[PDB]
Amino acid sequence: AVLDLDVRTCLPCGPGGKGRCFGPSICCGDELGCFVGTAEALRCQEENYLPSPCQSGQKPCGSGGRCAAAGICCSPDGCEEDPACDPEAAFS
């Protein structure tokens, strides 16, 4: 848990390290958005090598999960632009 060690967010995801993996074949990146079992989310395969901890939930929301990416309340079930964080949002 913790910040992995002090300042990092699990293992990066997408093109190089735009996002990361949140758990089950899922992924989330800043300018990348959030992917679940998608090409940009296959990075969870690298999590198969080293059982590694890493930061954790991203301030939960009532839109079905956590503030995944650029305002996406997502969990392991699915991701969706939650207006309570940044995309489909109002002043969030």
Q: What is the gist of this entry?
A:
With 92 residues, the chain is mostly beta strands.
How would you portray this structure in words?
The PDB classes it as peptide binding protein, hormone. The entry lists the keywords Dimerization, Hormone, Peptide binding protein. The structure is a monomer. With 92 residues, the chain is an all-beta fold. The chain has one domain (1-92): Neurophysin II, Chain A (Sandwich). It is built from no helices and seven strands.
Order of helices and strands: EEEEEEE
Identify the CATH homologous superfamily: Neurohypophysial hormone domain
Termini separation comes to 27 Å
Name the helicity range: under 10%
Strand order across the largest sheet: 1-2-3-4
* Coarse morphology: globular
Q: Count the domains.
A: 1
Structural class: mainly beta
Structure summary, number of beta strands = 7
Largest sheet: 4 strands, antiparallel
CATH architecture: Sandwich
- The CATH class turns out to be Mainly Beta
State which percent range the strand residues make up. Answer: 15-25%
Rg over CA atoms, rounded to whole Å, is 12 Å
According to CATH, the fold-level topology is Neurophysin II, Chain A
PDB class: peptide binding protein, hormone
Keywords: Dimerization, Hormone, Peptide binding protein
Assembly: monomeric
Entry title: (Revised) Solution structure of the monomeric form of a mutant unliganded bovine neurophysin, 20 structures
